[PDB]
Amino acid sequence: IFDINGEYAQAFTGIPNVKHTILGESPNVDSLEKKQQKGELYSEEYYCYKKIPYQALGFAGLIKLLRPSDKTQLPALRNALSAINRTHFKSRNIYLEKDDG
Amino acid sequence: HWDKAMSDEVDYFFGKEKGQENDWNVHIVNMKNLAQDHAPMLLSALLEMFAEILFRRGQERSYPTVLLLEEAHHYLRDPYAEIDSQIKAYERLAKEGRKFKCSLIVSTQRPSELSPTVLAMCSNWFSLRLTNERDLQALRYAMESGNEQILKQISGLPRGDAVAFGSAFNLPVRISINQARPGPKSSDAVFSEEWAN
Amino acid sequence: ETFLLYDDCRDTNQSKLAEWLDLLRRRRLKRTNVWPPFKSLATLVAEFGCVAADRSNGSKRDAFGFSNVLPLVKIIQQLAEDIRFKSIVNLNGGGELADGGTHWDKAMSDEVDYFFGKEKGQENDWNVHIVNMKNLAQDHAPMLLSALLEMFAEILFRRGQERSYPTVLLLEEAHHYLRKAYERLAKEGRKFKCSLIVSTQRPSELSPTVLAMCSNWFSLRLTNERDLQALRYAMESGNEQILKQISGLPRGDAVAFGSAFNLPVRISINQARPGPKSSDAVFSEEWA
Amino acid sequence: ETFLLYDDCRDTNQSKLAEWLDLLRRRRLKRTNVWPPFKSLATLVAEFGCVAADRSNGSKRDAFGFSNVLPLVKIIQQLAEDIRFKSIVNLNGGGELADGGT
């Protein structure tokens, strides 16, 4: 169920094996979520939090996201995306690396 | 590395293949804190990912699934698609669902803003009261199994009554629906309660 | 001597470019004997679209010219790497490419020979051919199926009236891919001994010209007034006392009129043994 | 001297096109004695629609005005390539021509 106004959780009270998930971030840092065991009847106040990583959009998804419409943006973007597994990062700046250090 | 990312993101949301272990039977996804400029893109991307993974799984490795969509006219059509060659989201999902056991439920209050190809894939129709005329005209254009004497009385239906026709019904009926217990809650506040403080 | 072509706008070796392209236009360089891959259609287009003139009597690669031809290479590259398009159509190439200037026609003729049959006199090894298309996607059906029909029409024309053989085509869900010069097969089909059967549930989405070349009509139940109006408009033989019955026919019950029937008849069609494999998808088996 | 014309929008001897075009429009040069082929209308339409003026006392082949004339040349070329239309109408030219405009 894709719930948009957040109203369908109350409807499933009493049925076993239900899962309720909230998209985004917790408003308070010290917020810990409670889990439920298999086979139990669902009760409310059992939820979770989740975020979508950017890696799960794909090459085509990111290209459709950025939308280059100029002279030489597409080939540069494609070359940058094709070489994303050979880049290293240490907390302030991006650097390349050979096998010899 | 590109494959496994979405390959596990799809499994987190929609479930695992046949024969694996799945914790839950009902999964509720809540989207209350999300802007309206970002919903179309993210939801379209999720549905395209589901379609692709469903194709890759095949028939032997698929499980019958039911997907419920609320207010589908907000994100099923692409605003940046004024040309007909940019809408490739719903058709693939509908075909792959008809083929690989994935049925869809579409709820909306503005059927005239929905693509006419979307509304011609359905086999059964449930219709409560509709008031605007261009909404009646978009439904008169795409139905297959009705008649003109049943579309006359839609405009005057009281609250809680519907009109049902399709392949599951031998002849069209006017029906009084039962009450859900317990039902859903309300998503709106009341000013007089706050101002009373 | 060789020379490299690059998809991107690399400035490397931009001095001696226009000479090679001008030699290529004039058909002076050497030719190949193998079909190149399909993705090789973006480099050549980009090179022909980005070449410009130099102020120092040389050559240059303008970035103002690449802009005018960018969407074409974009769509070519986006089509050349689609999973569901590379499972039906072949893009690798790697065959023979002979001389004489007639290398397109041989490839065009071979596929029609394989699909629709050979000509009169030679030998063909089948009498019923079933073409299954359950893997092909809804996004690609019109293009490929229209292309195959136009391919058939041209070889039909070239074969003449004297080398043709009478064939029957059964076309299903015909309103998806049968929608000036894209209807030659239907109009110019009676002359070359080719008869068609069209099956559809939405007759109103066909061109009124195609629907008017039918001699016999079989009609089952039909409910939307948009379809009844099209049938009423396009018909040429019959009455209007028999159109009033179509809205209420039971299952397996039809109304027939045309050349082969003296007067219009309402028929109870027989049941086929064995029938098509069609069975309704079941959800309650695996949920139990 | 002669001057070769192209149906494209390339950059070759395009700074003196305007003078040749104005000269032809004023009927101040040679005349021919044969029938040109049918396809020749493509290059002419391209050239009349593709001429412009450069900043530094010259002429430009501006592609902005070419897109305003693209469909015509496309239809002209496409009609002469079909094998059906070219088995009825003979378009090779090669005939005699008479002065006076008749």
Side-chain angles (χ1 to χ4, degrees):
Chain A
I1 300 168
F2 289 170
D3 195 7
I4 295 174
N5 300 351
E7 69 207 334
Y8 283 104
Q10 190 197 298
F12 280 82
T13 297
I15 296 89
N17 305 74
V18 191
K19 170 161 192 177
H20 183 235
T21 290
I22 313 186
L23 261 69
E25 197 65 87
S26 195
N28 297 71
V29 176
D30 49 7
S31 162
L32 192 80
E33 296 84 2
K34 187 76 216 65
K35 198 174 282 288
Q36 208 155 9
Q37 278 301 315
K38 172 185 283 294
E40 289 196 7
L41 314 182
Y42 172 82
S43 191
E44 196 172 2
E45 60 87 22
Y46 292 136
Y47 46 88
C48 175
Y49 278 85
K50 184 60 167 47
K51 266 177 185 260
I52 296 154
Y54 87 98
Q55 309 105 54
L57 297 182
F59 187 73
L62 278 72
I63 281 174
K64 194 199 311 304
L65 189 141
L66 300 180
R67 190 187 302 111
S69 180
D70 217 330
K71 45 204 83 181
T72 314
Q73 289 167 351
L74 182 63
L77 178 52
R78 294 190 95 218
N79 282 307
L81 282 155
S82 284
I84 192 167
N85 58 338
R86 297 175 186 280
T87 72
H88 304 255
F89 192 63
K90 180 64 72 172
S91 306
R92 279 301 210 191
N93 46 4
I94 303 97
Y95 62 103
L96 289 172
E97 196 184 22
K98 304 189 190 294
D99 310 293
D100 294 329
Chain B
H1 51 287
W2 289 106
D3 304 73
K4 278 184 55 49
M6 73 164 67
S7 188
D8 64 58
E9 191 65 22
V10 175
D11 299 337
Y12 172 71
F13 274 110
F14 299 112
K16 299 183 183 150
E17 315 182 338
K18 183 173 183 176
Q20 301 302 321
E21 175 78 353
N22 194 2
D23 288 329
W24 48 264
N25 278 345
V26 190
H27 189 187
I28 309 173
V29 186
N30 200 334
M31 302 169 186
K32 60 183 192 295
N33 55 6
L34 180 68
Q36 270 152 334
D37 60 5
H38 291 112
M41 184 61 80
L42 306 173
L43 302 175
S44 304
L46 267 172
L47 294 166
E48 293 180 2
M49 291 181 248
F50 188 27
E52 180 176 357
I53 302 304
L54 203 52
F55 170 50
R56 282 218 291 252
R57 278 191 197 166
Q59 167 150 45
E60 276 65 23
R61 290 180 279 119
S62 286
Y63 201 62
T65 309
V66 181
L67 193 45
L68 199 149
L69 312 173
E70 272 276 339
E71 299 300 319
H73 68 296
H74 273 152
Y75 49 101
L76 263 190
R77 82 291 183 276
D78 276 304
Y80 295 149
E82 292 180 345
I83 297 89
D84 314 316
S85 186
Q86 286 174 295
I87 301 103
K88 266 86 176 175
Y90 175 82
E91 213 160 355
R92 274 202 195 181
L93 186 60
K95 182 179 183 290
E96 287 297 303
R98 195 180 284 269
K99 279 178 60 171
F100 296 129
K101 309 176 250 181
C102 177
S103 71
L104 265 68
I105 310 175
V106 176
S107 307
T108 182
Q109 67 180 4
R110 286 285 183 173
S112 45
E113 300 175 355
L114 208 74
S115 182
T117 308
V118 173
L119 200 59
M121 302 293 290
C122 307
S123 301
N124 293 275
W125 290 267
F126 277 88
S127 178
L128 283 72
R129 179 159 182 165
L130 291 176
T131 47
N132 199 2
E133 184 69 65
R134 65 182 219 263
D135 287 321
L136 287 147
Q137 290 187 5
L139 174 62
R140 185 180 286 126
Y141 185 93
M143 50 162 259
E144 293 179 354
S145 43
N147 45 4
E148 283 294 338
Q149 68 90 30
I150 210 75
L151 291 195
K152 274 178 223 169
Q153 51 203 270
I154 288 179
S155 298
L157 282 170
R159 180 179 93 190
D161 292 26
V163 160
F165 51 92
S167 67
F169 302 87
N170 205 0
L171 72 164
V173 184
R174 191 180 148 150
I175 190 167
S176 290
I177 300 154
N178 283 352
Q179 201 178 0
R181 288 176 199 286
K185 66 179 74 66
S186 291
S187 168
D188 45 352
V190 168
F191 275 17
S192 286
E193 306 177 4
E194 318 182 45
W195 290 355
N197 282 1
Chain C
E1 190 174 6
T2 58
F3 189 69
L4 272 291
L5 297 167
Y6 310 108
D7 189 0
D8 44 4
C9 183
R10 294 159 142 181
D11 51 6
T12 307
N13 205 346
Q14 75 171 344
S15 63
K16 295 177 69 165
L17 187 64
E19 301 92 354
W20 284 76
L21 264 61
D22 204 357
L23 282 176
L24 183 57
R25 279 153 148 165
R26 283 184 274 113
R27 293 176 288 175
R28 305 285 201 185
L29 316 167
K30 209 162 171 303
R31 65 178 69 92
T32 181
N33 292 323
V34 66
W35 273 107
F38 172 69
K39 73 179 89 191
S40 55
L41 275 173
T43 74
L44 298 152
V45 168
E47 290 300 328
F48 273 115
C50 84
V51 60
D54 197 276
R55 200 181 60 197
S56 75
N57 301 73
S59 187
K60 197 189 176 184
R61 285 172 187 267
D62 193 358
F64 273 108
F66 198 93
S67 286
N68 297 312
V69 71
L70 190 137
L72 188 59
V73 303
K74 201 204 188 202
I75 64 173
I76 290 168
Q77 280 162 348
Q78 285 176 357
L79 209 55
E81 57 180 359
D82 189 8
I83 306 180
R84 271 166 88 71
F85 188 75
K86 65 173 70 167
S87 314
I88 311 281
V89 185
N90 196 45
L91 307 164
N92 298 323
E96 180 196 1
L97 185 56
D99 205 333
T102 53
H103 47 277
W104 293 107
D105 303 349
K106 188 68 174 63
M108 172 160 276
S109 304
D110 286 328
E111 285 293 337
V112 166
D113 268 18
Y114 180 93
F115 267 116
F116 299 106
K118 306 216 166 204
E119 73 190 45
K120 182 183 244 192
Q122 315 199 42
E123 193 73 12
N124 201 0
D125 51 280
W126 48 265
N127 269 319
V128 180
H129 200 180
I130 306 163
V131 193
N132 194 343
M133 292 151 180
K134 92 199 171 198
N135 283 351
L136 191 151
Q138 280 292 103
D139 316 330
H140 311 306
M143 323 197 277
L144 301 159
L145 299 187
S146 296
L148 265 73
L149 293 184
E150 279 177 2
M151 283 155 56
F152 190 25
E154 290 169 353
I155 294 90
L156 264 182
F157 165 67
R158 286 185 204 275
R159 267 196 207 171
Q161 182 64 259
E162 301 89 8
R163 295 181 269 137
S164 282
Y165 199 69
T167 62
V168 179
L169 282 177
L170 168 52
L171 296 174
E172 280 215 337
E173 272 89 6
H175 66 287
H176 285 301
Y177 47 93
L178 211 72
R179 61 179 69 254
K180 187 177 284 188
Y182 47 86
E183 292 165 351
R184 289 258 186 90
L185 178 74
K187 309 184 160 148
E188 303 284 317
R190 178 176 183 169
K191 295 176 71 64
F192 308 132
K193 319 182 182 73
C194 196
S195 295
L196 313 176
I197 310 176
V198 310
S199 291
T200 174
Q201 55 176 354
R202 285 291 173 101
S204 66
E205 301 199 6
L206 297 159
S207 66
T209 311
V210 158
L211 196 62
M213 290 181 181
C214 305
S215 288
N216 295 262
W217 309 64
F218 281 91
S219 186
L220 294 173
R221 188 141 168 177
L222 216 58
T223 317
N224 213 345
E225 285 292 326
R226 197 160 37 95
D227 299 331
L228 279 150
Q229 265 169 32
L231 183 60
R232 174 182 297 120
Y233 174 96
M235 92 165 64
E236 185 156 351
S237 160
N239 318 328
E240 292 180 353
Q241 283 82 24
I242 207 157
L243 288 197
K244 298 173 71 175
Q245 298 174 338
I246 289 160
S247 302
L249 293 165
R251 188 173 76 195
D253 195 346
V255 163
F257 53 92
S259 302
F261 307 93
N262 219 30
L263 72 165
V265 177
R266 186 176 147 146
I267 313 175
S268 295
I269 305 159
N270 281 332
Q271 166 159 33
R273 276 74 173 268
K277 195 186 84 173
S278 191
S279 72
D280 296 334
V282 178
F283 278 29
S284 51
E285 283 184 353
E286 290 189 354
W287 290 356
Chain D
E1 70 270 29
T2 63
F3 190 75
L4 291 163
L5 278 299
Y6 308 115
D7 52 354
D8 309 335
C9 192
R10 68 178 77 162
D11 196 357
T12 315
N13 298 78
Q14 60 95 22
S15 307
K16 36 155 180 166
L17 193 75
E19 283 77 2
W20 283 76
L21 299 182
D22 294 317
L23 187 147
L24 167 62
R25 292 192 71 181
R26 285 201 209 283
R27 294 168 61 245
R28 292 181 192 275
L29 72 164
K30 205 175 153 180
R31 293 173 279 196
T32 183
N33 283 14
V34 290
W35 269 112
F38 174 53
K39 60 187 282 189
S40 302
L41 297 171
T43 68
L44 275 151
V45 168
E47 290 283 7
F48 290 102
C50 205
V51 65
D54 198 353
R55 293 179 72 252
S56 66
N57 194 234
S59 87
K60 185 71 72 178
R61 289 181 179 175
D62 209 29
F64 263 84
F66 180 80
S67 300
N68 291 327
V69 76
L70 181 53
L72 189 57
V73 64
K74 185 175 180 292
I75 294 163
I76 292 158
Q77 292 180 356
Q78 187 158 257
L79 205 62
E81 299 294 326
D82 194 334
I83 67 166
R84 179 87 76 173
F85 189 91
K86 73 187 186 66
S87 305
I88 307 293
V89 179
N90 179 285
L91 55 90
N92 290 359
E96 278 70 2
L97 190 152
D99 205 53
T102 72

